[PDB]
Amino acid sequence: QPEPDMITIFIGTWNMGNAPPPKKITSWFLSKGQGKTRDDSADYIPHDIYVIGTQEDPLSEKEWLEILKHSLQEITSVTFKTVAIHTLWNIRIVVLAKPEHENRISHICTDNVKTGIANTLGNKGAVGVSFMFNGTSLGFVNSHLTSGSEKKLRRNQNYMNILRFLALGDKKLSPFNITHRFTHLFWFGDLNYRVDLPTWEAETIIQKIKQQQYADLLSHDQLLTERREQKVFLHFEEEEITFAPTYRFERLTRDKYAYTKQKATGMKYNLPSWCDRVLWKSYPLVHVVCQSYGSTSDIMTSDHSPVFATFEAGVTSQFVSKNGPGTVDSQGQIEFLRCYATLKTKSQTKFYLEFHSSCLESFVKSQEGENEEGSEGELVVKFGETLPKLKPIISDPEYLLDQHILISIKSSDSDESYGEGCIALRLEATETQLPIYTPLTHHGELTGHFQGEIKLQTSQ
Numbered sequence: 100q101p102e103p104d105m106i107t108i109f110i111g112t113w114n115m116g117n118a119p120p121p122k123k124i125t126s127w128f129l130s131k132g133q134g135k136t137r138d139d140s141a142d143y144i145p146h147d148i149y150v151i152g153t154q155e156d157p158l159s160e161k162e163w164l165e166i167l168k169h170s171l172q173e174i175t176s177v178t179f180k181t182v183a184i185h186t187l188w189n190i191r192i193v194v195l196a197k198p199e200h201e202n203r204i205s206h207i208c209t210d211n212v213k214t215g216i217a218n219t220l221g222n223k224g225a226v227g228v229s230f231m232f233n234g235t236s237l238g239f240v241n242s243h244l245t246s247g248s249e250k251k252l253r254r255n256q257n258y259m260n261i262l263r264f265l266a267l268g269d270k271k272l273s274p275f276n277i278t279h280r281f282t283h284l285f286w287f288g289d290l291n292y293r294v295d296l297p298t299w300e301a302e303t304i305i306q307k308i309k310q311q312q313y314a315d316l317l318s319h320d321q322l323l324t325e326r327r328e329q330k331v332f333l334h335f336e337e338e339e340i341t342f343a344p345t346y347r348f349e350r351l352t353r354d355k356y357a358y359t360k361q362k363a364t365g366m367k368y369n370l371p372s373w374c375d376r377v378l379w380k381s382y383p384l385v386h387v388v389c390q391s392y393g394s395t396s397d398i399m400t401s402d403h404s405p406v407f408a409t410f411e412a413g414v415t416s417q418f419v420s421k422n423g424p425g426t427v428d429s430q431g432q433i434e435f436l437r438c439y440a441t442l443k444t445k446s447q448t449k450f451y452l453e454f455h456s457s458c459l460e461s462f463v464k465s466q467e468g469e470n471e472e473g474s475e476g477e478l479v480v481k482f483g484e485t486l487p488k489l490k491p492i493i494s495d496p497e498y499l500l501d502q503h504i505l506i507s508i509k510s511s512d513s514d515e516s517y518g519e520g521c522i523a524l525r526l527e528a529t530e531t532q533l534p535i536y537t538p539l540t541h542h543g544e545l546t547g548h549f550q551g552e553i554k555l556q557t558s559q
């Protein structure tokens with residue numbers, strides 16, 4: 100039985116509005132309704148992995164897992180295995196997988212982050228799940244961010260707290276937050292970003308939705324605008340939105356948006372908005388293709404509609420040679436030439452690099468770089484030809500060209516990371532000097548750039 104080089108992943112996000120679901124929710128898992136929907140011909144084909152994020156979920160874990168497993172059984176005739184379930188207050192994530200994957204899945208981690216302070220600590224935050232699928236690391240984040248049209252800055256703060264403090268994936272990757280720990284990271288939930296148009300325009304917005312004319316609404320979506328200004332979700336992807344706003348509906352129909360201010364809303368307007376979202380970030384040059392992104396039309400127990408997204412995702416096999424694991428492959432080597440970091444920092448400490456990769460026995464520390472002042476005020480840290488030669492555990496090109504090197508640039512004085520990035524080994528050529536580049540981030544904000552040349556030697 101061959102190991103796969105591709106899997107499909109279903110991502111669902113649903114704010115349930117503290118109501119039990121209806122008897123049938125299969126449309127969600129089939130990616131049927133509005134937007135980019137799944138072909139009828141695929142209906143019986145199970146996804147490899149289903150990841151279900153709920154918010155305002157009133158069910159026990161037992162009650163929800165029964166409903167989910169029943170739904171998938173009815174669609175696929177497959178009894179899915181529970182990989183992980185984790186709940187913080189009424190925020191929940193469930194990961195289900197085909198039984199044939201049970202011995203492909205390992206290193207399962209769960210965590211949560213509670214956002215805010217005092218007044219604003221008690222119901223918002225995130226849950227997450229990570230695991231290895233053969234040689235591929237997968238992370239999943241379900242967040243319920245701060246509500247309200249006038250709190251986009253609070254949402255951006257909630258995002259930074261979640262990516263700083265959610266403890267998933269390989270704890271040895273100590274310089275790296277969740278935005279660097281995974282081959283594929285999916286981040287979804289009730290992110291609560293709103294369409295920023297005047298209150299008086301509510302009926303105009305409703306008209307536009309009835310005409311399926313979303314362009315003048317999406318141009319005011321706070322998540323799109325904050326992402327374009329690099330305020331949140333830097334280096335993440337989102338599929339184009341082609342479905343109606345998923346919030347705020349009258350329950351038991353989808354015919355009416357309930358937007359007017361009420362005592363129940365704290366006298367706040369809820370203009371129709373794309374609150375419910377799926378984003379992803381994969382390592383450079385790894386296959387990831389969104390094959391659906393939409394909302395259901397027939398599940399109406401909540402004031403939100405469910406959102407689905409599905410993906411093709413490249414995966415690699417648990418590689419064994421005669422040498423690695425448990426030793427290196429003399430044939431293999433990674434050389435860095437003419438490398439330099441450009442940092443936005445005002446500090447003047449010396450810096451060194453750490454190279455982290457599951458293709459190395461353990462992480463590699465460089466010598467300190469040579470600081471120079473850049474023309475336009477910047478710090479340039481030069482490494483020249485001084486960087487260590489990295490010795491991968493396996494030299495087979497079918498393995499090594501699929502790997503990635505995480506880079507952290509750390510202060511000699513404090514040993515704190517000033518920037519993190521990732522370099523793909525999926526090169527155009529081996530035994531050849533080739534340009535490499537990554538942006539550097541810290542706490543998910545841009546801090547600099549790393550660039551230079553690489554020379555990769557494989558057994559071929």
Ligand SMILES: N[C@H]1CCN(S(=O)(=O)c2ccccc2)C1
Binds near residue numbers: 122123166169170
């Ligand atoms: N124990 C009972 C309670 C819920 N389940 S169920 O399997 O998820 C299910 C849900 C809706 C229709 C048919 C079956 C059966």
